[PDB]
């Protein structure tokens, strides 16, 4: 009974993946309209790779309820872009154009500060 829980939308991972793919198609077909309405300086290929990167991060989830939430947030984040509730600043926050690269190796982190 402990592992018996109420679902959000999908009763198993197989149905969850169906929602993930439909969401990906929605984002894939919107980038050309987004890059045009907001007059962005990125290309459509750069836009479509960012969507790919965002989906790739959460590729190790095995909880259908968690996947449902990620899709719910994705659909919310999508409705903001389509209806132009966001602004050019919000869309470009996925890219971090004004943040200097931060080193990933041990030696470089050693020279600058104390964080691991």
């Amino acid at each position: 009974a402990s592992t018996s829980v109420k679902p959000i939308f999908s009763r198993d991972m197989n149905e969850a993946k169906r929602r993930v793919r439909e969401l990906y198609r929605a984002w894939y077909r919107e980038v050309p309209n987004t890059v045009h309405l907001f007059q962005l300086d990125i290309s459509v290929k750069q836009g479509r790779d960012k969507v790919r990167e965002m989906f790739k991060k959460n590729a190790h989830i095995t909880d259908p309820r968690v996947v449902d939430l990620l899709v719910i947030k994705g659909k919310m984040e999508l409705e903001e872009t389509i209806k132009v509730w966001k602004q050019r600043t919000h869309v470009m926050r996925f890219f971090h154009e004004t943040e200097a690269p931060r080193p990933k190796d041990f030696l470089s982190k050693f020279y600058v500060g104390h964080d691991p």
């Binding site: 592992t3 109420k6 679902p7 198993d12 909880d63 259908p64 968690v66 104390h114 691991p116």
Partner: protein
């Protein structure tokens, strides 16, 4: 006997991807689960009854203009309170933080006797009141 249909989820409960915390502050942090030690300037024991969870200290530097204490750690002041140790570890595990647990330190019972102050042959006979 609920009316709603239930499903089975045999996986570790992990919410690291829906809490919105940047990955910089999930993998490199080290939570500390503990019961606060009694403040030694006071005899009260009412601050040593709940379990706390704090994170590891990081750099504080001096503001060039005024001399204030600047920081870049967004978890410097975060303190959580828990009724028991088991509930504290549960919150750390599902949030993805690495943690250390320190067992509660309760003072051991002491044997007190006002009459020992005036012993006939023992070493506990005090010399002043």
């Amino acid at each position: 006997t609920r009316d709603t249909q239930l499903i089975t989820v045999d996986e570790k409960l992990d919410i690291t991807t829906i809490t919105g915390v940047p990955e910089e502050h999930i993998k490199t942090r080290k939570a500390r689960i503990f019961v606060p030690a009694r403040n030694n300037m006071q005899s009260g024991v009412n601050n040593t009854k709940k379990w706390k969870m704090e994170f590891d200290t990081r750099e504080r530097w001096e503001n060039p203009l005024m001399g204030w204490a600047s920081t870049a750690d967004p978890l410097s002041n975060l303190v959580l309170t828990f009724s028991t140790k088991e509930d504290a570890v549960a919150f750390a595990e599902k949030n993805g933080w690495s943690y250390d647990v320190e067992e509660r330190k309760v003072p051991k019972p002491k044997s007190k006797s006002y009459g020992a102050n005036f012993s006939w042959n023992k070493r506990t006979r005090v010399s002043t009141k």
